[PDB]
A = this chain, B = another copy of it.
Amino acid sequence: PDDLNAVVTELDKEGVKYKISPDGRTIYVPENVARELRLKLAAKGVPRKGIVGYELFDKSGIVLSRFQQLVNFKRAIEGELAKTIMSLDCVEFARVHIVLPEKSLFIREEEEAKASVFLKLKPGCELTPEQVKAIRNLVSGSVENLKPSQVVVVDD
């Protein structure tokens, strides 16, 4: 019962079909509701941004909204990249976040993207500059508007 009280009590008033995951950190709300909650919660609670928007609700599951599908696909791409990075002996855990351009200038043909890689390394192990460079090229190789020099790798 952590932090869920703030939203569920203000959503209990309207009376729309919502329910909490068996865990207790993932909520399921309509897409029109999730669109109002994603930006506000991202500034508030950060965990995996576990807010799922649906198009149709059922007791067994949900029909994902189109937006939620695209969100899930992005994180799936990032999860796969992180999985490859974790194949490194020194790397125990890895997380990849690709930053998408929010604007599009008519003066430019292409908008540049950014990317951050967070690594939990093995206590005694340490990455070489060539291995880090391999990481930058791996992530940037996924899309055309992302270059290795815009991929930042940090040890958290």
Contact = CB atoms under 8 A, between A and B. Distances in A.
Interface of A: 21-22, 38, 52, 54, 59-64, 66-67, 69-74, 76-77, 79-80, 83, 98, 100-107, 110, 141-145
A124 B142 CA distance: 31
B61 A70 contact: no
Nearest to A38: B66
How many copies of the polypeptide does the oligomer hold?
Answer: 2
A9 B107 CA distance: 25
16 contacts: A22-B106, A38-B66, A59-B106, A61-B104, A61-B105, A62-B103, A64-B102, A69-B101, A70-B70, A72-B100, A73-B100, A76-B145, A79-B143, A80-B143, A80-B144, A83-B144
